[PDB]
Amino acid sequence: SQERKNEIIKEYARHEGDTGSPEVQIAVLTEDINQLNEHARTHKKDHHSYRGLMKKIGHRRNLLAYLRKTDIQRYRELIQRLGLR
Amino acid sequence: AIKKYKPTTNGRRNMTSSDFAEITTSTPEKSLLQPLKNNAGRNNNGRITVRHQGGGHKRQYRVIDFKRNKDNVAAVVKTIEYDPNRSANIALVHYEDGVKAYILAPKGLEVGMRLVSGPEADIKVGNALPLENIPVGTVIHNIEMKPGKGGQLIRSAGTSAQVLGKEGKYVLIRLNSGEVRMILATCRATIGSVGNEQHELINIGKAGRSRWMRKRPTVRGSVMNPNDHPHGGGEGKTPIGRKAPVSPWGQPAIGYKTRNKKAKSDKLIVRRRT
RNA sequence: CCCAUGUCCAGGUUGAAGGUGCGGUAAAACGCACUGGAGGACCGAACCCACGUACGUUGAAAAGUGCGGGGAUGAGGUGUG
RNA sequence: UAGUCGGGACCUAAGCCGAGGCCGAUAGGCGUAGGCGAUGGACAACAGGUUGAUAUUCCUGUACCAGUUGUUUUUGUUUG
RNA sequence: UCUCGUUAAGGAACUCGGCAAAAUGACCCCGUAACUUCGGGAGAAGGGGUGCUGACUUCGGUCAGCCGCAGUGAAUAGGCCCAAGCGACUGUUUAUCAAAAACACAGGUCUCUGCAAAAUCGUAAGAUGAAGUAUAGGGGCUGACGCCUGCCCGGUGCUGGA
RNA sequence: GGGAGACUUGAGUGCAGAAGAGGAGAGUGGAAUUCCAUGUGUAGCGGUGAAAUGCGUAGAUAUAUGGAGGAACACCAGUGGCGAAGGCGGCUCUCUGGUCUGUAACUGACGCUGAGGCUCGAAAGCGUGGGGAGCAAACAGGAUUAGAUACCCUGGUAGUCCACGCCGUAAACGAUGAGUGCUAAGUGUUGGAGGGUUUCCGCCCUUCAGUGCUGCAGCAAACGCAUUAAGCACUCCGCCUGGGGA
RNA sequence: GCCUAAGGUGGGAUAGAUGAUUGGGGUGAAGUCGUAACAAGGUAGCCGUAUCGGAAGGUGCGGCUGGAUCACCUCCU
RNA sequence: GGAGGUAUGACAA
Ligand SMILES: [K+]
Ligand SMILES: [K+]
Ligand SMILES: [K+]
Ligand SMILES: [K+]
Ligand SMILES: [K+]
Ligand SMILES: [K+]
Ligand SMILES: [K+]
Ligand SMILES: [K+]
Ligand SMILES: [K+]
Ligand SMILES: [K+]
Ligand SMILES: [K+]
Ligand SMILES: [K+]
Ligand SMILES: [K+]
Ligand SMILES: [K+]
Ligand SMILES: [K+]
Ligand SMILES: [K+]
Ligand SMILES: [K+]
Ligand SMILES: [K+]
Ligand SMILES: [K+]
Ligand SMILES: [K+]
Ligand SMILES: [K+]
Ligand SMILES: [K+]
Ligand SMILES: [K+]
Ligand SMILES: [K+]
Ligand SMILES: [K+]
Ligand SMILES: [K+]
Ligand SMILES: [K+]
Ligand SMILES: [Mg+2]
Ligand SMILES: [Mg+2]
Ligand SMILES: [Mg+2]
Ligand SMILES: [Mg+2]
Ligand SMILES: [Mg+2]
Ligand SMILES: [Mg+2]
Ligand SMILES: [Mg+2]
Ligand SMILES: [Mg+2]
Ligand SMILES: [Mg+2]
Ligand SMILES: [Mg+2]
Ligand SMILES: [Mg+2]
Ligand SMILES: [Mg+2]
Ligand SMILES: [Mg+2]
Ligand SMILES: [Mg+2]
Ligand SMILES: [Mg+2]
Ligand SMILES: [Mg+2]
Ligand SMILES: [Mg+2]
Ligand SMILES: [Mg+2]
Ligand SMILES: [Mg+2]
Ligand SMILES: [Mg+2]
Ligand SMILES: [Mg+2]
Ligand SMILES: [Mg+2]
Ligand SMILES: [Mg+2]
Ligand SMILES: [Mg+2]
Ligand SMILES: [Mg+2]
Ligand SMILES: [Mg+2]
Ligand SMILES: [Mg+2]
Ligand SMILES: [Mg+2]
Ligand SMILES: [Mg+2]
Ligand SMILES: [Mg+2]
Ligand SMILES: [Mg+2]
Ligand SMILES: [Mg+2]
Ligand SMILES: [Mg+2]
Ligand SMILES: [Mg+2]
């Protein structure tokens, strides 16, 4: 939802107007991944959509690796807020 | 769900049981309990009239409201309960006026559902209506055969029936066995199928468990003597050695129909099955 | 054989499901510990049974005894009616 | 040798009997109300002493349960 | 003759057959194969230790010493292993010559049964089945599990037709 | 290569749009087949190269009216579309993936490939429980034939369908791994974008991403490929080393 | 008295030899049965899978053209 | 015109 997306963007934006950044993208990808997991458990035969879920997961992983290699302080701050591992 | 026991023993090997997940309590309603002695297949003459019955666990009868003729108030489902006397589960319902009853638990029944009975009840699972008020194509259970007598058909776990049409004062119904017949339109039925559908999949596992469930062993006629059974006698194992297999009383056991050939209900049975 | 109602089974052993923690993972499956205490489960008295053998065979006994033997929470034993 | 133990004057289970009733050559069979029926429920005292032989039964001490008569004390007499 | 104890050398040569007896036996520790349904097989097997007295202890031992032929010093507590048949298994049975490969069994399958069910006891009434209702109840056969279960409907039965 | 900065083109986010048999779930529509019931009706019907088996006077086929049930979705429909591939075609709704085009607000190389692992994976097949119209291994009968365990005919079970769990293989093919950049043209078509005309409709041009055909340079043993390369290059992976035995 | 070579016992691990019998495979100038493939090979062939049959093979289901011939529309020269 | 789609037959010579 564009409303839920924007409100997550504002909560995690590194500054005013920041749509693109590891924190914003990862957080939006985090609620996208959670919602698609709920869909997945209800529709266990929807293999085509599951592939979209997996690509979202790999993109989130890649952005997390970039954030960790770039600023470990930010990386730790973010994963706590989103409750990642 | 069905839980499969690990083979910790040969008795436990291949055995399965229900996990009773849908059962919400094990405290039956005292007011609705009545005593039943185990008849063990013996009639008022004290003779065994039905073989292979007796022993096993003690049971208290739960008075089930099969009639579902209290139409004034709705009944809220309080519990899904185990009933030792039937394959289905039962639901304790509290009528708003304080009358407590047990009903058969339909598939999909949930604690908290508000059920109604009567001509004006909605077509919802657990509601009971006269068959004349039930639209064609509806899955039903607990069908009474006579007005006010109470549900008699389609009561075992997982069973269901379907309304096919209305002709005259009769409703065309497909029963669980596949038979299609007419039921008096003033007879009531409950919407839905009977729950505990998984009941049929249980692997009893061991002889003792059947004994718990009040089944005494069956002895095959072929290993009796001739004075006990038409299949008795002979040296070593033997074949049937007769025209057709028969019961202990000489009645053919494969294919021979036993329904009365002059049954009154024959006029009401449209298409038989089983 | 069954019905109703009572009652009996020394003492040990094993460690099922489930649960918890920590690993593992996107989440999982899953791995490891701990806990948990299942079973016509194991060893073994009482109790029930009756597999071998000797003896007995005008018997201690119209079927037993001795030495061993099987079951021993169960499809169990047993009392009363 | 017992108000207190066990049983009855309490209760019901299986089962049994069964007013009318239903069924049936006779005889009788079944069965409702109603009962009977413990192996279960309920239920008030104990320790010691004593005899050759009985004792939670007798005796000593100290109790408890149900009820009776009387005395005093309170409160209620028909909006009780 | 019975019941019991010990026997040189040999050690199953006995015998239908190791029948009977002998041997094993407790606890702790090391260790433990094929195969498997992954639970098991296991207490597999095969080995070691066990008394007493001090010292020392993390309380289980350790070190040291001591005595005997022998230390669960007596009594009471598995003999084991390899392989084949049959039955899956725990159970059951010929009270009093047969305990088994027989019965039962969970599982399989067929078939009957729409409820005043079929089935059974009864002349009947009345009962059991059931205060159950086709995922239920009766009957026949098979007999855990795994892989499977071919051909024949002329005959005989059953079912339907008419 | 390491370290500290800076950058916006690659990559991604935002904003604005575009198309779609992409997937999953739950419903639902008509045509047709079969069966069933009822009229009408009378001796054939069906089938082949030719026949017969088969069905039919116990009333067929045909025809009319209905009922049941299953499966597949005529036209639209198209080197058309979508998807990683396998694949996806009636309609409706719910949930859901991806792609494409503008914009240039944001991040600032976050990228590519990817052994091992994981996931998906036509059809047949397997397990449990349903369903079963049509079709049809097996199988039966009729033919053909020297023989026919075939092709043909009449039947017909599994299977084909659904749920759930296995299987993990196909000339699973473009018989062409993925990413990137570069290197004549012509002409279709699908979805976009921008402008110049056109009263609109549309035409004209520019462009992005697909999808085809034709064709230079170059490449190739040849066949052929040719901006959707098999050309010219760089990165990473898979794989090959005579045939048979395998 | 500790350590310890050799020796003994025990249960496993591993390598070669050998074994009634058994399996497919290769070879063998001129054996028997059929004719499956190559032409449209006389039922187009092949791939995977299933099932059946003396045998090649047959049949079903899906797939491929690495498909002969005549008949269409799109495309393009 | 071109393109993807709809029974038997030795051996050597
Ligand atoms: K079992
Ligand atoms: K039950
Ligand atoms: K039996
Ligand atoms: K016999
Ligand atoms: K004896
Ligand atoms: K008394
Ligand atoms: K008593
Ligand atoms: K000897
Ligand atoms: K062993
Ligand atoms: K010693
Ligand atoms: K022992
Ligand atoms: K046996
Ligand atoms: K058995
Ligand atoms: K067997
Ligand atoms: K025995
Ligand atoms: K027996
Ligand atoms: K079997
Ligand atoms: K049966
Ligand atoms: K049989
Ligand atoms: K059985
Ligand atoms: K026959
Ligand atoms: K016949
Ligand atoms: K979309
Ligand atoms: K199947
Ligand atoms: K184009
Ligand atoms: K061929
Ligand atoms: K393909
Ligand atoms: Mg029976
Ligand atoms: Mg016998
Ligand atoms: Mg007889
Ligand atoms: Mg016989
Ligand atoms: Mg015989
Ligand atoms: Mg036991
Ligand atoms: Mg024991
Ligand atoms: Mg006794
Ligand atoms: Mg006995
Ligand atoms: Mg034992
Ligand atoms: Mg008393
Ligand atoms: Mg009587
Ligand atoms: Mg009388
Ligand atoms: Mg009474
Ligand atoms: Mg008392
Ligand atoms: Mg005395
Ligand atoms: Mg000697
Ligand atoms: Mg000696
Ligand atoms: Mg000898
Ligand atoms: Mg001799
Ligand atoms: Mg012996
Ligand atoms: Mg001793
Ligand atoms: Mg046995
Ligand atoms: Mg036994
Ligand atoms: Mg005997
Ligand atoms: Mg005996
Ligand atoms: Mg048998
Ligand atoms: Mg398939
Ligand atoms: Mg392959
Ligand atoms: Mg192009
Ligand atoms: Mg040929
Ligand atoms: Mg051919
Ligand atoms: Mg060919
Ligand atoms: Mg064939």
Strand order of the largest sheet of chain B: 9-16-10-13-14-15-17
- What fraction of the residues of chain B are assigned to beta strands by DSSP? 15-25%
Could you tell me the radius of gyration of chain B in angstroms?
22 Å
Instruction: Give the helices and strands of chain A as they follow along the chain.
Output: HHHH
Main β-sheet of chain A: number of strands, strand sense, barrel status? none
**What shape does the CA trace of chain A take?**
globular
Structural class of chain A: mainly alpha
What gyration radius of chain A follows from the Cα positions, in whole Å?
14 Å
Question: Termini of chain A, distance in Å?
Answer: 25 Å
Structure write-up:
The structure is cut from a larger assembly and holds chains A (85 residues) and B (274 residues). Chain A has 85 residues and is mainly α. Chain A is 79% helix and 0% strand. Chain A contains 4 helices and no strands. Chain A has helices spanning 2-12, 22-42, 47-70, 72-82. In chain A, helix 1 packs antiparallel against helix 2, helix 2 (22-42) runs antiparallel to helix 3 (47-70) and helix 3 (47-70) runs antiparallel to helix 4. The longest helix of chain A is centred in the last third of the chain and has 24 residues, at 47-70. Chain B is mainly β. Chain B is built from 1 helix and 17 strands. Chain B has one helix at residues 207-212; strands spanning 2-4, 16-18, 33-35, 60-62, 75-81, 90-95, 100-104, 114-115, 128-130, 139-141, 143-144, 151-153, 161-167, 170-174, 180-184, 188-191, 269-271. The longest helix of chain B has 6 residues, at 207-212. The two termini of chain B are 29 Å apart. One potassium ion is lined by residues 82-84, 87 of chain B. Chain B binds 6 RNA strands through strand 12 and helix 1. Chain B: Part of the 50S ribosomal subunit. Forms a bridge to the 30S subunit in the 70S ribosome. Chain B: One of its GO terms (molecular function) is structural constituent of ribosome. Chain B: One of its GO terms (biological process) is cytoplasmic translation. Chain B: Residues 33-54, 220-274 are annotated as: Disordered.
